Assembly symmetry: C3
Homo-oligomer: 284 residues x 3
Amino acid sequence: VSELGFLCGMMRSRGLRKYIISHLSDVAKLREEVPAALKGAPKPAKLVLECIGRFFLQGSKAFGKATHMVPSRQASLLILEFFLLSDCTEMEPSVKEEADLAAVTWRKRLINEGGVSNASDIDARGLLLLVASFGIPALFRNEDLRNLIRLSCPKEISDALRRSRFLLARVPDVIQGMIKNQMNVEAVDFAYTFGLEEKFPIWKILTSFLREHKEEWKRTREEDSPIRLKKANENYLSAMKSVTRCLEDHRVDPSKLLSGWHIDEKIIQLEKEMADLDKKMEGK
Amino acid sequence: SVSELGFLCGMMRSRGLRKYIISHLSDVAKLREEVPAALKGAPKPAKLVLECIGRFFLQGSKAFGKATHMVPSRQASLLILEFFLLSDCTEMEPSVKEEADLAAVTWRKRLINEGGVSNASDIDARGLLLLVASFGIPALFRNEDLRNLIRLSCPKEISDALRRSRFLLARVPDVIQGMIKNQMNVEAVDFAYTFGLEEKFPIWKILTSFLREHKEEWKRTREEDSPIRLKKANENYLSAMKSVTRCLEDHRVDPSKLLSGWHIDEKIIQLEKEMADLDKKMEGK
Amino acid sequence: PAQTSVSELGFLCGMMRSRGLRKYIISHLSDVAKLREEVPAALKGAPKPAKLVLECIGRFFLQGSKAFGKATHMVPSRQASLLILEFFLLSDCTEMEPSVKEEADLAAVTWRKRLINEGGVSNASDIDARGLLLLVASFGIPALFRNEDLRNLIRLSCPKEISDALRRSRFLLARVPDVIQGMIKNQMNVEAVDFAYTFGLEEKFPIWKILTSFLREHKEEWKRTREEDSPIRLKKANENYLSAMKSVTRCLEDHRVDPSKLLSGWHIDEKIIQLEKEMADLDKKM
């Protein structure tokens, strides 16, 4: 059997690191065979945890570090994904407690760098992947996880993300939070993104959203003053298109799920009324 | 050359114009010379330009390993908008106007959701600027928005293009006006000059008044027994002055003519000398 | 002409072509390890080294002239300017002309003024922070600079890589203490220790009273949390303490101090494995 097996069963951290960093020319192959080999190894949770890196949870890094992705960081991200998607419940409490402190220290770091809200694509998806694989620190707030998911560009990460089971347990909880906060559309996004549609009244959430904005839009109806009229029109349309995109992103046809709002039609109506409203601004 | 393009625009072929423009990124210059020309010949050029930028603009640049630097998908979009401003083509259908209007409202909303317009890529800022510049400015756009867009877009290299809008020309005056009152003066003049509005603005009054205020606040804290307070008020003053000299020089205005009176390079040497003085005298240790 | 008996670096420095030195450095950027041994040398072989590096930084550095499309991925110009500032701190050139000092001083001033108009110094490119810190470290800290500004530059700067060159300052070595005494009074402990270690000033500060006041206020908070109602509030207070420790640990291992030797009598090495074992306990029992 080919070298990757040799690596895994022989438990060589930096060997595997170098190996992947080496095969980066075609990542496809790595997706196919890496998580395979990882199963054929002796206690893979700790292989992957040692295999991770220091500068990753360490107090700040590199130089051109933020918003780039050098092959060190990359190899470690990718290992995390591959380990998620190799499907192993294997880790014993040593590995767990460690990966836990890891994520905690990491979060502290990000919180100092200005909060989790401002964080790198690389950092966010990094801690997401981390915690996702080894479990979520008690300390982590919900809003934190929200921000991680938000920043990580989680969609091209979905398959491997929804394999999580630490994530799968905690995420619904965090979406409920978002739902209670007027963050409707985004909650529908998170839900759809993890394969959690089943656990949220989605049709309800979107419908409520649209309704509230319909009422806001009616609220300012005769303001005279054409500009307030146009402003509230733009706002409403934006909300519509907002739901429109969230849905078609996930391959949901709003002409069906929200059929009965006749969104396409209300959009043409609002835009026509807007051009009308513009002819009534300049001279004639 | 004018034929690939006179076909492309005559024949209203969107994906074609874009692929062309992406192809000829090698020489961008002659691209800038031929395209706005070609664009006058399109049947409904507004429409063609909207079709030309499409969605990947307003939603894009989310590619993972970061460095918001510029791929030639976005590049071509910027290019098409500039050329479309240069074509002096106008009076688009109200259909395209409102579509592009919504596009802008949405793009802005995104920018806000991402931490504000104040922090936005040069590419996002310039893109949204060029969008509104061409197809009009949505109601929801706040003056301070326009101000940051212009600020972040490096408008100097876009200037003559920006200068053709009439959307930015009806609105930009209100913006420089508001910027004088809230005290932005040096930048209000930078904008003024950038759009070729120096006529409609008392530039001398504004720069001058700015320097006045700094000269006085330079005197509040002036003569008393405080090498530190001295050097400090000195640096504030120096810097406001260099702010004026760089701003005028950027527009190839001689500050030693237009702001002569006020001899600046002079006051700057006097002040940097005074400073070195205090730097030798502050020793005491 | 046996004038070719000198080096190209040497010629470039002696002849004082800012532009030429920049182009040269930009071009040899492939190998920076060589430039680090060669340039600080050739630098003292110039008529006026400070005016030359100031000429070399260029308008484009401080002014906030950044290539439109490009990311800070280094239009190599910026890489070069940071490298020149660095190599000139490394060249042990003192005695600069006061014209150049107050010019550079003004540059550092307008740089800051700009950083502030951009959302504050606190948010800064790693590039900007390193650049300004190097600037000030070579030509002196201006009046207007507050200690806070300085802290953020030092922190945001990734100093540990730049520390050898950073340690030659004396504009820095003179101010750093005032800044650290500031940070200690601010409850900044592990990080103020981190600064004092990076600037060579470990000896001039109560490292022990610091790392201690910290680890003890953090045991005192965590004893208050050994009761009161939850296995979750327990794992919380517990990861809290465990982090604070692991941070003192990583801080000293960074600077090649032994966590034990400096703090031993704590046995934070034992305490770590004790609280890890203890949340593996609270992990099975939840």
